[PDB]
Curated annotation (Swiss-Prot):
Provenance organism: Homo sapiens (Human)
Signal peptide: none
Annotated CDD domains: CRBP2
Record key words, sorted: Cytoplasm, Retinol-binding, Transport, Vitamin A
Distribution of this protein across tissues and organs: Higher expression in adult small intestine and to a much lesser extent in fetal kidney.
Comment on protein domains: Forms a beta-barrel structure that accommodates hydrophobic ligands in its interior.
Protein name: Retinol-binding protein 2
InterPro entries assigned to the protein according to its UniProt record, in alphabetical order: Calycin (IPR012674), Fatty_acid-bd (IPR000463), ILBP (IPR031259), Lipocln_cytosolic_FA-bd_dom (IPR000566)
Gene name of the encoded protein: RBP2
The family this protein is said to belong to: Belongs to the calycin superfamily. Fatty-acid binding protein (FABP) family.
């Protein structure tokens, strides 16, 4: 449950629009993003991660080392500077992005061939479920 390697295909996506709105993403682009198929590609070696979420139009890419703070510029999302930090809380992978938005980050629970992802921003939570291909 601590191995997130793989290609992960979306099966569930709840409150995607509320989470994007909390990040101030443009209403027009939110309209397009809600239609796109999302694929999550994770390369994990020890504490080193490369995470890629891909669609037709926009990709989101981030590389990090567990336990090492990094400057993140969310250039393909809301275009903000955050201080990001990914850690293990038991078997949960937790990211906190310190910056303008409060309660901003994400959490991953890996349960066999299922991956549960919760994206948070302010009072909004987006809940996604993926299956390993
Ligand atoms: C562990 C996995 C994480 C943190 C994945 C996060 C995914 C995103 C921030 C993706 C956001 C996207 C949008 C802004 C809309 C269009 C395409 C996406 C899925 C890349």
């Amino acid at each position: 449950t601590r191995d997130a390697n793989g290609t992960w295909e979306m099966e569930s996506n709840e409150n995607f629009e509320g989470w994007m709105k909390a990040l101030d993403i443009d209403f027009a682009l939110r309209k397009i993003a809600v239609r796109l198929t999302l694929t999550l590609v994770i390369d994990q070696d020890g504490d080193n991660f490369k995470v890629k979420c891909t669609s037709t139009f926009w990709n989101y890419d981030v590389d990090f080392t567990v336990g090492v703070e990094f400057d993140e510029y969310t250039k393909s999302l809301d275009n903000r500077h955050v201080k990001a930090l990914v850690t293990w809380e038991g078997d949960v992978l937790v990211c906190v992005q310190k910056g303008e938005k409060e309660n901003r980050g994400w959490k991953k629970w890996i349960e066999g061939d299922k991956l549960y992802l919760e994206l948070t921003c302010g009072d909004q939570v987006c809940r996604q479920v993926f299956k390993k291909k």
